[PDB]
C-alpha cells in the first residue's frame, strides 16, 4: 500500500556496479516527505522536475536504480554525461527525467581487512547504448597479438574496490539511488 522506499534505501546489501541492480517500484503511494522534509541523504538533485511538484505524475515505471559506485562518481550519473562509469558501466540518456538521492554509506559498506566485494570493469573496446541493461557475463581479453593470461599487454578487466572504512568522501561507498520516472 505505502511505498517500499525503505526496502531500497533501508536495505542491507546492494549490487556490483558493473552489473548493477534495478528494482521496479509500483502501486505504492510514494510519500517523498520522508526524504524531502530535511536533508539526511546528502545530494538531492532532480533533473527535469521539482521536488515540490513530484505528485503530478504517474508511477508507471519508477526504476529505483540501486548500486554503489564511489564518492566522486555520482557526478557521472547526470543526463548527457560521459566517463568511466557512464560510457559502459551505467549510461544515462541526455533527455533523462528523474532524481539522484546519493547518500554516504561509509559505515555500512566497509571492511578494515579490505572490502573487495564490489567490482567494475575497467577496459572496453566499444561503448554501450542507453536504456540497455548489462546482465550478460562474457569473457574478454586485450589486443596486440592474441594472448593468454596477464602477459605483456593483456589485462583482467574487472578490478575490485578496496573499500576500507577510512577513505575520503570522494572514494567512500556512496550508496546511490537513481529514480527514473518512466
Amino acid at each position, epitope marked *: 500500500n505505502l511505498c517500499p522506499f525503505h*526496502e531500497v534505501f533501508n536495505a542491507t*546489501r546492494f549490487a556490483s556496479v558493473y552489473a548493477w541492480n534495478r528494482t521496479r517500484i509500483s502501486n505504492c503511494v510514494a510519500d517523498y516527505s520522508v526524504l524531502y522534509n530535511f536533508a539526511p541523504f546528502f545530494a538531492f538533485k532532480c533533473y527535469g522536475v521539482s521536488p515540490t511538484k513530484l505528485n503530478d505524475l504517474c508511477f508507471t515505471n519508477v526504476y529505483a536504480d540501486s548500486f554503489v559506485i564511489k564518492g566522486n562518481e555520482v557526478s557521472q550519473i547526470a543526463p548527457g554525461q560521459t566517463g568511466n562509469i557512464a560510457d559502459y558501466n551505467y549510461k544515462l540518456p541526455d533527455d533523462f527525467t528523474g532524481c539522484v538521492i546519493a547518500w554516504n554509506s561509509n559505515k555500512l559498506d566497509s571492511k578494515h581487512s579490505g572490502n573487495y566485494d564490489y567490482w567494475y570493469r575497467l577496459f572496453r573496446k566499444s561503448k554501450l547504448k542507453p536504456f540497455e541493461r548489462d546482465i550478460s557475463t562474457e569473457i574478454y581479453q586485450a589486443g596486440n597479438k592474441p594472448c593468454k593470461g596477464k602477459g605483456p599487454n593483456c589485462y583482467f578487466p574487472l578490478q575490485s574496490y578496496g573499500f576500507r572504512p577510512t577513505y575520503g568522501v570522494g572514494h567512500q561507498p556512496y550508496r546511490v539511488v537513481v529514480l527514473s520516472f518512466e
Partner: antibody, heavy 127, light 108 residues
Framework: QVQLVQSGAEVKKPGASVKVSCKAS????????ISWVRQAPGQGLEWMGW????????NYAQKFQGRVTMTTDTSTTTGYMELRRLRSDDTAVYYC????????????????????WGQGTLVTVSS | EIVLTQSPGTLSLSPGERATLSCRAS???????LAWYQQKPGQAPRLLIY???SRATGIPDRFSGSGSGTDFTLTISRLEPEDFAVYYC????????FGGGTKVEIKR
C-alpha cells in the same frame, strides 16, 4: 502512540496446540512484518520465526524447523503464532515485536531491528 | 549458525557510573545486521541500538552502540535508577540468533 495489544496467559497441558494473539496498531500494516520471540522463565531470549504480512512469506528457525506455524489477520492488523506438540520445557513468556529486520515486499533484509514490543504472554504447560 | 555468546552474565553498578555490554560473534557478521534491547523487570525489551550505530526513537543521549565483524558493544554513560534492566544482542547476517542476555543489577 504505538500500541501492541497482546493476548493473556494460558494454562494449557502437554499434547495440545495453542495459537497466540497479537494486535498491533499505529502504523501502516502492510509495510512491516511481525516476529516472535520466546523466553522461558529464568532464561534468555531465543528466536522463533519471522512472517511478512504483505505476501504471506514465512521464515522459521531450524530448532523449530517444523513444529510451528504463523498466521496473520489483515482486517484487524493482528499477528498470530501457533506451536504444536507442547513439551514439558515449552513453558515460556512469548513476545510479539514489530519487524524492521527483513523487508516485507522484497524479503532480502533491512538494516534495523525489532523496534516496538508487546506486553508478553506466559503460557504454562504442565501435566 | 553464528553463536553470539553474550558476556558477561550479570552487571551490578552504582547510580551514576558508566555501563558497557559486549556481544562477540564466531564468524564475521556485517555491521548492518545487529541490534540491542533493554528489558525492564516484568516488562518487554525495547530496542536501543539498531544497525549497530543508530539510536532508536525516544532513546536518550546516554545510550550508544558500535562494533563490526566479530565484536560489538553497547554503551551507557549515566546510570539512572531506571537504567537497571535486562539487555540482549541480536544478529541477522546469516539466520537470526540472540545472545545469552546480561542482567543489570544495583550495586550497594
Amino acid at each position: 502512540q504505538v500500541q501492541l495489544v497482546q493476548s493473556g496467559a494460558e494454562v494449557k497441558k502437554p499434547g495440545a496446540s495453542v495459537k497466540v494473539s497479537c494486535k498491533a496498531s499505529g502504523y501502516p500494516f502492510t509495510s512491516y512484518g511481525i516476529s516472535w520471540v520466546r523466553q522461558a522463565p529464568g532464561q534468555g531470549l531465543e528466536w522463533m520465526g519471522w512472517i511478512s504480512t504483505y505476501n504471506g512469506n514465512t521464515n522459521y528457525a531450524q530448532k523449530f524447523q517444523g513444529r510451528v506455524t504463523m498466521t496473520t489477520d489483515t482486517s484487524t492488523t493482528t499477528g498470530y503464532m501457533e506451536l504444536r506438540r507442547l513439551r514439558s520445557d515449552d513453558t515460556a513468556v512469548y513476545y510479539c515485536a514489530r519487524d524492521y529486520t527483513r523487508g516485507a515486499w522484497f524479503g532480502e533484509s533491512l538494516i534495523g531491528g525489532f523496534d516496538n514490543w508487546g506486553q508478553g504472554t506466559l503460557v504454562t504447560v504442565s501435566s | 549458525e553464528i553463536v553470539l555468546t553474550q558476556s558477561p552474565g550479570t552487571l551490578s553498578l552504582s547510580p551514576g557510573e558508566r555501563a558497557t555490554l559486549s556481544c562477540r560473534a564466531s564468524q564475521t557478521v556485517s555491521s548492518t545486521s545487529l541490534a540491542w534491547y533493554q528489558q525492564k523487570p516484568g516488562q518487554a525489551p525495547r530496542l536501543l541500538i539498531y544497525g549497530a550505530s543508530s539510536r532508536a526513537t525516544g532513546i536518550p543521549d546516554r545510550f550508544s552502540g558500535s562494533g563490526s565483524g566479530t565484536d560489538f558493544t553497547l554503551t551507557i554513560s549515566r546510570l539512572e535508577p531506571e537504567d537497571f534492566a535486562v539487555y540482549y544482542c541480536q544478529q541477522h547476517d546469516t539466520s537470526l540468533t540472540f545472545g545469552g542476555g546480561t542482567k543489570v543489577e544495583i550495586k550497594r
